[PDB]
Amino acid sequence: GSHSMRYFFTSVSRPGRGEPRFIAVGYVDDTQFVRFDSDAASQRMEPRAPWIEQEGPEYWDGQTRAVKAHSQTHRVDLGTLRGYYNQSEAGSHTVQRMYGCDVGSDWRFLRGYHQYAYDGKDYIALKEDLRSWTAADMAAQTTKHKWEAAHVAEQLRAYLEGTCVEWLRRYLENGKETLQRTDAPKTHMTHHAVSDHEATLRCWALSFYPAEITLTWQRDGEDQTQDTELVETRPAGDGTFQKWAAVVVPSGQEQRYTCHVQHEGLPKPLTLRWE
């Protein structure tokens, strides 16, 4: 199937309390594999998946050097953005950055990304052609122009199309037990009485990987979208994911309702009924 690699960086200014808090994390599909935290004692890029632990000191030393270089550029960026938005020295602000690549099911390059947000909103993003920039703010134009003139997109294009997908493929091969696995949802239902005339039927999906999943309810085969409570897919803490979906079923009507589960791990989509 299709795969992705992404890096996510958050830098938060802390006026009067030292240097900005800086956290970087890297993921392949839904599996975290590296981290750096500027507040931690090690000051090194650290492994967070077992398959990356055998990469060796050239990898760790060079990824520690690169990630510290990213910390420093965000440290400068916080000061730059404050100037651009004419903001005071007192307030805490947030820069976020994401980059990475997708390959398709042939494992060939499919899409690349590189984008920034400032205080929770889109600041600048590389466009899909990897040749142009999308910039909404007036302040952001200054960045766009600076980047057009320094040919930042060209450098990013070469990385996203080359290095980024080559290393994604290496990781896929090296972590094939972890990354190229699927864990099928283990499913069940619970039934709990609200009152005498209706009850909540909840359909559960547990221990599944990857996170993408569709869980729906139907009543006589009609979709119950407006009347289904659906919660956000959540991590179990062990690399797997969890989700549930519930409907309110009036008395004597349990047989009308089916829960439908779609997931890459299933040999065929499930149809579950309380019976």
Binding site: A66, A69, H70, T80, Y99, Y116, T143, V152, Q155
Partner: peptide, 9 residues
């Protein structure tokens, strides 16, 4: 593997 070149806004 990280991008190896500095980018400043």
């Amino acid at each position: 593997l990280l991008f190896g070149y500095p980018v400043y806004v």
